[PDB]
Amino acid sequence: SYPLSKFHFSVEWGGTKIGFTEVSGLDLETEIIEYRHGASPEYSKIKMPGMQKFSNITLKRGTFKSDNEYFQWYNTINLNKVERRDLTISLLNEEHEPVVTWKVKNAWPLKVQSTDLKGDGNEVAIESMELAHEGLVIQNE
Template identity: 70%
Template sequence: MADYPLPKFHFQVEWGGTKIGFTEVSGLDVETEVIEYRHGASKEYSKTKQPGMTKYSNITLKRGTFQSDNEYYDWWKENVFFQEGNSTGSKYRRDITISMLNEEHEPVVVWKIKNAWALKVQSTDLKADGNEIAVETIELAHEGLTIQND
C-alpha cells in the first residue's frame, strides 16, 4: 500500500454531543510567541529568542443554512446574555472535536478544542442573480487546541 497525503474533504465536527456537517473549517492554528531578551553586558550585539506564551487562532465553521435551524444564533445569544449578567460566560463554553476521516470513516487526525464560545455569527449574503447555496458562518474563540495524528 502506497503512502499518500490525506484528502481534506472528509471530516466531521462533534459539537455539544452531536455531529454536525460543515462545508468548511478553518483556523486550526497554534503559535508560540517569541520573547526577545538581551542583557547589557552581552558580548553579542543581538537579542536571544525564547519561546513565550501559546496563542490560538479563532476557528471559523461554515455550513449550509437550513429552515428552522437557529443553533448558531442561539449559542451566540446564550453567550451574550450570560455575559450581560456580569459573569464570565463559561457556562456556555463547549469542547469541540474535529476529525479528519479515512475511507472507512474512522478518525485519522483529531483536533480537540477546549472551552470554545461563539463570538461572531454571520448569516448568508443574498443575491438576486446568485446560483449558490446559502452558507452561514460562526467564529469561535477558545482556550486550547491539541492535535492527535494516530
C-alpha cells in the same frame, strides 16, 4: 506511504448535524523574548519562548429549514455568562474512521453571520460562525 486528502471530515459541536463545508484557524503560536548584553562578541540577540496564544476558529455550512442552531447557541449570552462546549474535529479515511483529531476546550461563539441576498445569481445560502477558545491538542496516532 500515501498522503491524506482534506475533503472528508466531521465536527462534533453539540448540535444535531455534523456536516460542514469548511474549517479554518487551527493554529498554535508562542511569543518571543530577546536579550543581549554589551560584552558579547556576537552582535545579534539570543531568543527564548514566552507566553502563548490561540486564534479563533471559523465554521461554515449551508442554511436549512427548521435549523436555528447557530442563533440558539449565541442567545445563551447573559452579561458575562455563556454555555461553553467541547469541540472535536476529525479527519476521516475511506471507511469513515478518525485519523487526525483536533480537541478544543471551552468554546463559545462571538460572531454569527447570515447570508447575503442577491437576485441575479444562482447561489445557495451559507452561514458562518466564529469561536473563541482556551486551548488545542492534536492527536495523530
